[PDB]
């Protein structure tokens, strides 16, 4: 029953989402990147509450909290290995030195940054399903939301690639101190076994709890407990029986994310021995994608 809430929650939420997403994408420090991503996700939470589906807000909160915590733990292990240097401009080729962190970070980041075919895609999908359109500043709100949503890909890719699979940029000591043959042992590791087990169990339990909440809320049979609110938003109508208009509208954002993924993957910023072969691989991928789509849809 608050006019001020109605006007302020969506605008500030979307502005914060866009700002945090872009700053996180352009960030170079791991903890700063996670902090700005947290700001962006809090903006998205504000916008979800503005839409007014408390179930969607709770789902977004759970997903963000679990995967943000897991990613924070992974980057903490990375920083400890790198001797308290949190900037990944001095991090490179850490995949071999921190094998568990690399894969755990991959999973956690793909879930955190809303990406297709991941547990974290549905939260953004539901937010866009519930977004209201009667606002006066709807153009700015929607544009900021789209930019913030797409911004996830850049920061996730930069963090993961620069930390792990980029060229070795760190000090020679970091690698040499750990590459000594004397250290080769069944006990060898640059992290803690307890830390690895804690991260693994956190990821497993987060997956299970998120699935339980998704079944409770998003299933055909609604089995969530009473929320003690008498305001019904009608947003579930576009989740149960979406129309062609909305179904095709979502495709715009899906393809925007696809193009951005292609850019961050196939775009060359430095000379390499694999420049021509990279362009050739891009051509092969495009042509194969076209033919595969043709066969799947028409020729079977």
């Amino acid at each position: 029953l608050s006019k001020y809430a109605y006007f302020i929650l969506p605008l500030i939420g979307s502005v914060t989402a866009f700002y945090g997403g872009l700053v996180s994408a352009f960030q170079s420090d791991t903890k700063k990147t996670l902090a700005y991503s947290t700001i962006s996700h809090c903006g998205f939470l504000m916008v979800s509450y503005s839409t007014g589906v408390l179930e969607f807000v709770i789902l977004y909160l759970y997903v963000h909290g679990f995967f943000k915590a897991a990613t924070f733990l992974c980057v903490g292990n990375v920083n400890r290995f790198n001797r308290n240097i949190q900037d990944f401009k001095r991090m490179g080729g850490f995949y071999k030195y921190l094998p568990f962190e690399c894969l755990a970070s991959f999973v956690c980041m793909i879930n955190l940054s809303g990406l297709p075919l991941t547990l974290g895609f549905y939260i953004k999908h539901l937010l866009f399903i519930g977004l209201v359109e009667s606002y006066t500043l709807y153009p700015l709100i929607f544009s900021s939301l789209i930019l913030g949503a797409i911004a996830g890909v850049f920061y996730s890719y930069r963090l993961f690639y620069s930390i792990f699979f980029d060229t070795k940029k760190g000090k020679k000591a970091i690698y040499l101190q750990a590459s000594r043959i004397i250290l080769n042992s069944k006990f060898y590791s640059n992290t803690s076994l307890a830390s690895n087990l804690s991260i693994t169990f956190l990821v497993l339990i987060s997956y299970t709890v998120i699935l339980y909440l998704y079944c409770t809320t998003l299933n055909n049979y609604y089995s969530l407990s009473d929320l003690k609110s008498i305001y019904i938003n009608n947003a579930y109508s576009y989740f149960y029986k979406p129309d062609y208009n909305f179904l095709n509208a979502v495709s715009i954002l899906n393809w925007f994310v696809i193009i951005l993924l292609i850019s961050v993957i196939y775009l060359n910023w430095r000379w390499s021995y694999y420049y021509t072969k990279s362009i050739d691989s891009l051509s092969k991928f495009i042509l194969f994608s076209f033919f595969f789509f043709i066969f799947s849809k028409y020729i079977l």
């Binding site: 297709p116 179904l247 899906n254 799947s296 849809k297 028409y298 020729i299």
Partner: protein, 62 residues
Amino acid sequence: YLEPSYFHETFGHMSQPPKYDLIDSNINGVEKKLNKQILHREHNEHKLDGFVSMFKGSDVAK
């Protein structure tokens, strides 16, 4: 696998692999022909009935 919604809304509905039952092969001849025609008519009528029922039932909830 279980949630192809992203694929449907990003690439469209692809050709579905064949799925049918061979119950109709039990009968043969004019019996089979007439029953097949009746079933086809029933299916079309069922689709139309669903459409008209959805359109009409807007006022069911008072």
